[PDB]
Amino acid sequence: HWGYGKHNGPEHWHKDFPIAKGERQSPVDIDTHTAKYDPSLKPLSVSYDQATSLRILNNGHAFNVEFDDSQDKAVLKGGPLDGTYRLIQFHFHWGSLDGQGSEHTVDKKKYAAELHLVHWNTKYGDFGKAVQQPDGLAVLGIFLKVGSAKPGLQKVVDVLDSIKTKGKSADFTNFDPRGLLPESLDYWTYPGSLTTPPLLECVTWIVLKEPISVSSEQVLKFRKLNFNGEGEPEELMVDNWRPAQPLKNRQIKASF
Ligand SMILES: Nc1c(Cl)cc(S(N)(=O)=O)cc1Cl
Numbered sequence: 026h027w028g029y030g031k032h033n034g035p036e037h038w039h040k041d042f043p044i045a046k047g048e049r050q051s052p053v054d055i056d057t058h059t060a061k062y063d064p065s066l067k068p069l070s071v072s073y074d075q076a077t078s079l080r081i082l083n084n085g086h087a088f089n090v091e092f093d094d095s096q097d098k099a100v101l102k103g104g105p106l107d108g109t110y111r112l113i114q115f116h117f118h119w120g121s122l123d124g125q126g127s128e129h130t131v132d133k134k135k136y137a138a139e140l141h142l143v144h145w146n147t148k149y150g151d152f153g154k155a156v157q158q159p160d161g162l163a164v165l166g167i168f169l170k171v172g173s174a175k176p177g178l179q180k181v182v183d184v185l186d187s188i189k190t191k192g193k194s195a196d197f198t199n200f201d202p203r204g205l206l207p208e209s210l211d212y213w214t215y216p217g218s219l220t221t222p223p224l225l226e227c228v229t230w231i232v233l234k235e236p237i238s239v240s241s242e243q244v245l246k247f248r249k250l251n252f253n254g255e256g257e258p259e260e261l262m263v264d265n266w267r268p269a270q271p272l273k274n275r276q277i278k279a280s281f
């Protein structure tokens with residue numbers, strides 16, 4: 026019954042998921058002075074103009090904006106990646122207050138939230154097969170800081186009222202994820218894992234350097250969500266982030 030609380034939070038996950046203390050766990054702190062520019066990186070390609078969103082879902086840990094991944098359309102390629110990776114969902118991690126909420130950190134700085142756009146390697150045919158492979162997934166990570174509103178986010182913010190509790194979903198078509206990207210695609214990359222159970226070490230992390238700004242009101246609405254199910258005592262969905270994990274035998278590379 027894993028979660029983020031005292032008796033079920035990240036310090037407990039290793040019991041049911043021993044890979045929590047593995048060799049390539051995420052997230053990590055990005056030490057900007059130890060990251061090295063890698064000229065072997067090729068241009069990053071984020072091709073989301075044919076993306077088809079379908080639904081949004083409160084899964085009791087975050088909320089997922091789900092996409093139609095039955096065909097080739099919204100894909101991530103280039104950069105550190107070999108081949109083609111298809112967009113399946115995005116979600117966020119956020120805090121109780123603006124000084125925390127991100128998973129990755131930058132020189133130990135915690136941002137207010139972190140967006141994860143999740144893609145799977147089409148050479149493995151389905152998501153399920155891809156998460157049995159050391160290069161099965163690519164997650165594009167984008168930090169959120171609080172200041173001006175992100176217009177492209179507001180459609181998400183306004184449907185959250187309709188999925189307050191665990192297991193609730195709503196139709197969510199025609200959402201364009203290009204509206205959540207910053208201007209620059211400068212990034213850091215490293216091999217890692219899912220940041221929640223089952224913590225599978227199947228992910229190429231691509232973390233953009235440029236945060237997007239969202240408004241206080243927008244993130245305040247994220248914090249109105251619930252971890253609990255309908256009719257249960259209210260546990261606000263906040264601080265659904267895993268702290269930074271040991272880097273071990275890894276190097277973080279810069280695209281810039
Ligand atoms: N299933 C799943 C889990 Cl458990 C974690 C992540 S994450 N947060 O992007 O690493 C992404 C997915 Cl798709």
Ligand SMILES: [Zn+2]
Binds near residue numbers: 220
């Ligand atoms: Zn995530």
